[PDB]
Amino acid sequence: NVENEHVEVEIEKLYKFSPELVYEAWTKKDLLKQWFMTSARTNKEIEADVKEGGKYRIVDQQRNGKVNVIEGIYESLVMDEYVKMTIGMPSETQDVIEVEFFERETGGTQMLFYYRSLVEKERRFTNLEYKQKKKEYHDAMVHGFELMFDKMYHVIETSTQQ
Ligand code: NA
């Protein structure tokens, strides 16, 4: 649809953890299973082939027997430095995640997260209605990723105490 536009989410987090510890959260299966679109208790399946061009597949338990399936690809993996991945399998577009890890002087890491997602324009939508749907979608994604990263934060914290 020539008319579908992207929302973009930009998130900066500062952690005391080393870039290596944060990068690991993104690239290790039994860590990702705890935070990335899933959690320890709701995770049904996770497969992750963590190399460039490799697939991941997360099945997450929702209410009343329903399931969420999340699949995508690692496009770029540079050690302690950079992950580019898709949400969506190259019906329905791929969202893009690009996340960079920088070492601070002081802390462990500055984490710079970028996300791009195509929002579908509905039949007969006014300019305002479309703009309102992208704003709602953006705020929902900001909130869902915040909740994820702060979950990711405790998963990292509890490998540091246990
Ligand atoms: Na997906």
Short mmCIF file of all heavy atoms in Angstrom, two decimals, residues 81-106:
data_model
loop_
_atom_site.label_atom_id
_atom_site.label_comp_id
_atom_site.label_asym_id
_atom_site.label_seq_id
_atom_site.Cartn_x
_atom_site.Cartn_y
_atom_site.Cartn_z
N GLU A 81 28.38 -4.95 20.56
CA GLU A 81 28.31 -3.68 19.84
C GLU A 81 26.98 -3.41 19.14
O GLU A 81 26.45 -2.29 19.19
CB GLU A 81 29.48 -3.60 18.83
CG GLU A 81 29.60 -2.28 18.15
CD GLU A 81 30.72 -2.21 17.11
OE1 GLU A 81 31.71 -2.99 17.22
OE2 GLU A 81 30.62 -1.34 16.21
N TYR A 82 26.42 -4.41 18.48
CA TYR A 82 25.33 -4.09 17.57
C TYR A 82 24.55 -5.29 17.20
O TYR A 82 25.10 -6.30 16.76
CB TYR A 82 25.84 -3.36 16.32
CG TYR A 82 24.80 -2.86 15.33
CD1 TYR A 82 23.80 -1.96 15.70
CD2 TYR A 82 24.86 -3.25 13.98
CE1 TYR A 82 22.84 -1.50 14.77
CE2 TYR A 82 23.93 -2.79 13.04
CZ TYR A 82 22.93 -1.92 13.44
OH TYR A 82 22.03 -1.47 12.49
N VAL A 83 23.25 -5.16 17.41
CA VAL A 83 22.28 -6.11 16.88
C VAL A 83 21.27 -5.39 15.95
O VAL A 83 20.65 -4.39 16.33
CB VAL A 83 21.51 -6.87 18.04
CG1 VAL A 83 20.51 -7.85 17.45
CG2 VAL A 83 22.46 -7.59 18.97
N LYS A 84 21.18 -5.87 14.71
CA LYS A 84 20.08 -5.57 13.78
C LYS A 84 19.29 -6.86 13.55
O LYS A 84 19.84 -7.90 13.15
CB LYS A 84 20.57 -5.03 12.46
CG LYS A 84 19.48 -4.58 11.47
CD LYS A 84 20.20 -4.05 10.17
CE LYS A 84 19.28 -3.72 8.99
NZ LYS A 84 17.96 -3.13 9.50
N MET A 85 18.00 -6.81 13.86
CA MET A 85 17.14 -7.94 13.72
C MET A 85 15.77 -7.50 13.19
O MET A 85 15.43 -6.30 13.21
CB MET A 85 17.05 -8.71 15.06
CG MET A 85 16.42 -7.95 16.19
SD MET A 85 16.62 -8.76 17.90
CE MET A 85 15.65 -10.39 17.53
N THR A 86 15.03 -8.47 12.65
CA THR A 86 13.63 -8.28 12.31
C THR A 86 12.64 -8.87 13.35
O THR A 86 12.95 -9.85 14.09
CB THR A 86 13.24 -8.81 10.93
OG1 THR A 86 13.05 -10.22 10.98
CG2 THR A 86 14.24 -8.45 9.86
N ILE A 87 11.50 -8.20 13.41
CA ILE A 87 10.26 -8.71 14.02
C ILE A 87 9.34 -8.94 12.84
O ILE A 87 8.95 -8.02 12.15
CB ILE A 87 9.63 -7.70 14.96
CG1 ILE A 87 10.54 -7.46 16.15
CG2 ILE A 87 8.28 -8.23 15.48
CD1 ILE A 87 10.17 -8.36 17.38
N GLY A 88 9.06 -10.20 12.54
CA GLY A 88 8.43 -10.51 11.27
C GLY A 88 9.39 -11.21 10.34
O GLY A 88 10.59 -10.92 10.30
N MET A 89 8.83 -12.13 9.58
CA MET A 89 9.60 -13.05 8.79
C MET A 89 9.63 -12.54 7.32
O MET A 89 8.57 -12.43 6.67
CB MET A 89 8.94 -14.43 8.96
CG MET A 89 9.85 -15.63 8.81
SD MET A 89 11.46 -15.69 9.91
CE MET A 89 12.50 -16.87 8.72
N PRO A 90 10.83 -12.15 6.81
CA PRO A 90 11.00 -11.67 5.43
C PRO A 90 10.15 -12.41 4.41
O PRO A 90 9.93 -11.91 3.31
CB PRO A 90 12.49 -11.93 5.16
CG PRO A 90 13.17 -11.79 6.52
CD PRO A 90 12.11 -12.11 7.57
N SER A 91 1.27 -11.17 3.38
CA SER A 91 0.34 -10.82 4.47
C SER A 91 0.82 -9.64 5.31
O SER A 91 0.09 -8.65 5.47
CB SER A 91 0.08 -12.03 5.38
OG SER A 91 -0.66 -13.06 4.72
N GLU A 92 2.05 -9.74 5.83
CA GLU A 92 2.48 -8.89 6.97
C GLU A 92 3.98 -8.56 7.06
O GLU A 92 4.83 -9.45 7.18
CB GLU A 92 1.99 -9.52 8.29
CG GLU A 92 2.15 -11.04 8.34
CD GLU A 92 1.84 -11.61 9.70
OE1 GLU A 92 2.02 -10.87 10.70
OE2 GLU A 92 1.43 -12.79 9.76
N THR A 93 4.27 -7.26 7.04
CA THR A 93 5.64 -6.70 6.97
C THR A 93 6.58 -7.08 8.14
O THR A 93 6.11 -7.57 9.19
CB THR A 93 5.58 -5.15 6.84
OG1 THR A 93 6.88 -4.58 7.03
CG2 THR A 93 4.61 -4.56 7.86
N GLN A 94 7.89 -6.88 7.94
CA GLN A 94 8.86 -7.00 9.04
C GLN A 94 9.07 -5.65 9.70
O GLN A 94 9.42 -4.64 9.05
CB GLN A 94 10.24 -7.47 8.58
CG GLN A 94 10.31 -8.60 7.63
CD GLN A 94 11.35 -8.32 6.57
OE1 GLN A 94 11.09 -7.61 5.60
NE2 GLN A 94 12.56 -8.86 6.76
N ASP A 95 8.90 -5.64 11.01
CA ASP A 95 9.44 -4.60 11.82
C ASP A 95 10.98 -4.77 11.93
O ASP A 95 11.54 -5.86 11.83
CB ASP A 95 8.82 -4.60 13.20
CG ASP A 95 7.28 -4.62 13.16
OD1 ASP A 95 6.66 -4.17 12.15
OD2 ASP A 95 6.71 -5.05 14.20
N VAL A 96 11.62 -3.63 12.16
CA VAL A 96 13.06 -3.54 12.23
C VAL A 96 13.43 -3.13 13.64
O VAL A 96 12.89 -2.19 14.15
CB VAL A 96 13.61 -2.52 11.16
CG1 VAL A 96 15.02 -2.04 11.50
CG2 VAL A 96 13.52 -3.14 9.73
N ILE A 97 14.35 -3.86 14.24
CA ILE A 97 15.07 -3.43 15.45
C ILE A 97 16.56 -3.18 15.14
O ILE A 97 17.22 -4.01 14.55
CB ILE A 97 14.95 -4.51 16.57
CG1 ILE A 97 13.52 -4.47 17.16
CG2 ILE A 97 16.03 -4.31 17.66
CD1 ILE A 97 13.22 -5.61 18.19
N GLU A 98 17.08 -2.01 15.52
CA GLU A 98 18.53 -1.77 15.47
C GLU A 98 18.94 -1.25 16.83
O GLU A 98 18.40 -0.26 17.29
CB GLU A 98 18.91 -0.80 14.37
CG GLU A 98 18.53 -1.33 12.99
CD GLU A 98 18.71 -0.37 11.86
OE1 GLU A 98 18.96 0.84 12.09
OE2 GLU A 98 18.64 -0.83 10.68
N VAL A 99 19.83 -1.98 17.51
CA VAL A 99 20.19 -1.64 18.86
C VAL A 99 21.73 -1.62 18.99
O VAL A 99 22.42 -2.60 18.68
CB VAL A 99 19.47 -2.55 19.94
CG1 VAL A 99 19.84 -4.00 19.78
CG2 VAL A 99 19.78 -2.04 21.39
N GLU A 100 22.26 -0.48 19.43
CA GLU A 100 23.68 -0.31 19.62
C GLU A 100 24.06 -0.17 21.10
O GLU A 100 23.36 0.48 21.87
CB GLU A 100 24.18 0.88 18.79
CG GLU A 100 25.57 0.62 18.23
CD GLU A 100 26.10 1.71 17.32
OE1 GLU A 100 25.35 2.65 16.94
OE2 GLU A 100 27.29 1.59 16.94
N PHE A 101 25.19 -0.81 21.46
CA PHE A 101 25.73 -0.83 22.83
C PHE A 101 27.07 -0.08 22.90
O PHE A 101 28.01 -0.42 22.18
CB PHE A 101 25.90 -2.29 23.29
CG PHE A 101 24.70 -3.15 23.02
CD1 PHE A 101 24.64 -3.95 21.88
CD2 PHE A 101 23.59 -3.11 23.86
CE1 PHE A 101 23.50 -4.71 21.58
CE2 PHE A 101 22.46 -3.87 23.58
CZ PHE A 101 22.41 -4.68 22.44
N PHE A 102 27.15 0.97 23.71
CA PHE A 102 28.40 1.72 23.90
C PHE A 102 28.87 1.60 25.34
O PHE A 102 28.07 1.68 26.26
CB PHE A 102 28.22 3.20 23.58
CG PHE A 102 27.91 3.49 22.15
CD1 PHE A 102 26.58 3.42 21.68
CD2 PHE A 102 28.93 3.84 21.25
CE1 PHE A 102 26.28 3.68 20.35
CE2 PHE A 102 28.62 4.12 19.90
CZ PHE A 102 27.30 4.05 19.46
N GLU A 103 30.18 1.42 25.52
CA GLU A 103 30.78 1.44 26.86
C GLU A 103 30.85 2.88 27.35
O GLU A 103 31.29 3.77 26.61
CB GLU A 103 32.17 0.84 26.83
CG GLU A 103 32.55 0.03 28.07
CD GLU A 103 33.67 -0.96 27.78
OE1 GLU A 103 34.03 -1.09 26.58
OE2 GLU A 103 34.19 -1.59 28.76
N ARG A 104 30.39 3.13 28.57
CA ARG A 104 30.56 4.44 29.19
C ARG A 104 31.86 4.48 29.98
O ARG A 104 32.43 3.43 30.28
CB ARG A 104 29.38 4.73 30.11
CG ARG A 104 28.04 4.46 29.49
CD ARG A 104 27.02 4.08 30.53
NE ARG A 104 26.68 5.20 31.41
CZ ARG A 104 26.15 5.05 32.62
NH1 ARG A 104 25.90 3.83 33.08
NH2 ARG A 104 25.87 6.11 33.38
N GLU A 105 32.35 5.68 30.28
CA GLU A 105 33.41 5.84 31.32
C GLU A 105 32.80 6.43 32.59
O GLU A 105 32.42 7.61 32.65
CB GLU A 105 34.65 6.61 30.84
CG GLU A 105 34.34 7.78 29.93
CD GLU A 105 35.44 8.81 29.95
OE1 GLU A 105 36.62 8.43 30.11
OE2 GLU A 105 35.11 10.01 29.82
N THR A 106 32.78 5.58 33.61
CA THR A 106 31.71 5.44 34.63
C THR A 106 31.15 4.04 34.36
O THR A 106 31.87 3.04 34.45
CB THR A 106 30.55 6.54 34.62
OG1 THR A 106 29.55 6.20 35.60
CG2 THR A 106 29.82 6.68 33.25
#
